[PDB]
Amino acid sequence: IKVLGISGSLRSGSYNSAALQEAIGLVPPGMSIELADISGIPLYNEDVYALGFPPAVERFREQIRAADALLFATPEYNYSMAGVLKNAIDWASRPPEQPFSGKPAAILGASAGRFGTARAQYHLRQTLVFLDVHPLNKPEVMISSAQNAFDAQGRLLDDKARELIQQQLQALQL
Amino acid sequence: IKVLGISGSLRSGSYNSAALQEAIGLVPPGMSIELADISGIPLYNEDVYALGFPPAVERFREQIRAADALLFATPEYNYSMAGVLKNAIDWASRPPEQPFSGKPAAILGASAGRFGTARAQYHLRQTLVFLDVHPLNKPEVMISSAQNAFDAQGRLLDDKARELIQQQLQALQL
Numbered sequence A, B: 001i002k003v004l005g006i007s008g009s010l011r012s013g014s015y016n017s018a019a020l021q022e023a024i025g026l027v028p029p030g031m032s033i034e035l036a037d038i039s040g041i042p043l044y045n046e047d048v049y050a051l052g053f054p055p056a057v058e059r060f061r062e063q064i065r066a067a068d069a070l071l072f073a074t075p076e077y078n079y080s081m082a083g084v085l086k087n088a089i090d091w092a093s094r095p096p097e098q099p100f101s102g103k104p105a106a107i108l109g110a111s112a113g114r115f116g117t118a119r120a121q122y123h124l125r126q127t128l129v130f131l132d133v134h135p136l137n138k139p140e141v142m143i144s145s146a147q148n149a150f151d152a153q154g155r156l157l158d159d160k161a162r163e164l165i166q167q168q169l170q171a172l173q174l
């Protein structure tokens, strides 16, 4: 079961990239996770699209088409998903045969304050559902106070979190 | 009264851009609309921001700070606002003293086909309130079937949408 991990944050220390990094070692037997790189994807511009998909967008789209399932790690930016993550989905959603169609997915999000991700995870869920994606309803995974939830070398300390992801990955495998 | 028009679309024929332009031909005395340019704003990345605002973002934040009101024309992509617009908002919202705070703003959205922008407008309204913007609730301005609503090189053929822009600009002045 090839699972594609998608972070909505480009920063090297990104707690969201970190959580998907930890999910690699939390997968169950039979499943495996590979992180997608969207740093190369540009700002959406219909004119550019008309001329054809940017190299970085073709690679991404084909990673989605090929993966058996998707795992999203969306940060919340101002009461919604991060623009960057949305922008990448925008590109990837263009005809013909946008690869999202039919794929199952799991959503989780990391924020640093005391809330976050609740609104971004909902918006992301609706956006994905709009593209015919079938996301897992539960469990619900949110990493609050992430700045304390991880250490320098990006490692998740909360057993609850480690366990929740394991749960989701299984719930995903089913 | 200086007003900032922000289009969430970068394509040359953008109906959301074309709509704001029309509004310029509709301003009443004592009000002027200038169109911000976000095309130069890069994808958001915390590591880049840590070293200072890109010039484009800088130019953008100051226009917001200086303008007495904001006029947003957001297209709707995949059940939410355009990723491009959200990214510009993400960049502009960073401390120190992000300029959205306090500014009154009005929303409108241009889309082709069936529905459009109703979700994007909601998310946008929400995100902006989160930044302490005072967006107007009435009137709702949705330009549907935009592909027919506009002719070659601008000009809003639909008289209905015209009334709303006018009304929206008048309410805004108040």
Ligand SMILES: Cc1cc2nc3c(=O)[nH]c(=O)nc-3n(C[C@H](O)[C@H](O)[C@H](O)COP(=O)(O)O)c2cc1C
Residues within 6 Å of the ligand: A008, A009, A011, A013, A014, A015, A016, A017, A075, A076, A077, A078, A079, A080, A110, A111, A112, A113, A114, A115, A116, A117, A146, B046, B089, B090, B091, B093, B094
């Ligand atoms: C433009 C921007 C908007 C943000 N908005 C919110 C927000 O609405 N709520 C919240 O709890 N945190 C918010 N944050 C903080 C992020 O959740 C926090 O910095 C997080 O560590 C980012 O993780 P990532 O780098 O893994 O994406 C925002 C950060 C930025 C740069």
Ligand SMILES: Cc1cc2nc3c(=O)[nH]c(=O)nc-3n(C[C@H](O)[C@H](O)[C@H](O)COP(=O)(O)O)c2cc1C
Residues within 6 Å of the ligand: A090, A091, A093, A094, B008, B009, B011, B013, B014, B015, B016, B017, B075, B076, B077, B078, B110, B111, B112, B113, B114, B115, B116, B146, B147
């Ligand atoms: C990611 C994406 C999703 C879109 N989804 C729809 C849709 O569901 N229904 C529809 O009628 N048009 C849809 N459109 C078309 C736009 O509404 C149309 O191209 C519009 O004219 C763009 O206006 P703008 O250039 O002012 O943003 C979509 C466009 C993009 C880029």
